[PDB]
Design a protein around this ligand. Structure first.
Ligand code: FES
Ligand code: FES
Ligand SMILES: [Zn+2]
Ligand SMILES: [Zn+2]
Lengths: 65, 65
């Protein structure tokens, strides 16, 4: 059971970096479900995923505090 | 199918927050594969997962710059 159906299958290992001083919103959600249409950002696609599969995954929230 | 077999299965949706000013080091990896024993941090478990499942997932790297 791989967890990523389609994101960047041209890459051997999908890694994304965030230089945190570059964040502009107070809270910026990052995708941990591999279904987002704006991956690596979270666009709320995890909700449909969780219902479809009885799963409980959600985003990582980067906060400026 | 679901992507998180074992982490915090009692929570309806697993969400984590990071206050970016509180990062301890230059580069901190956060888990996107749901296999880390230090979740939400990445502990390198994605490598074994990718090999076993023919998958290509990896961490989110939070960088101080
Ligand atoms: S869209 Fe993937 S965690 Fe929200
Ligand atoms: S242990 Fe999950 S992405 Fe590294
Ligand atoms: Zn949500
Ligand atoms: Zn790695």
């Amino acid at each position: 059971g791989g967890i990523n159906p389609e994101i960047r299958k041209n890459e051997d290992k999908v890694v994304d970096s965030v230089v945190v001083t570059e964040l502009s919103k107070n809270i910026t959600p990052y995708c941990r479900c591999w279904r987002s249409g704006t991956f690596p950002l979270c666009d709320g696609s995890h909700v449909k995923h969780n219902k479809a599969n009885g799963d409980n995954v959600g985003p990582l929230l980067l906060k400026k505090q």
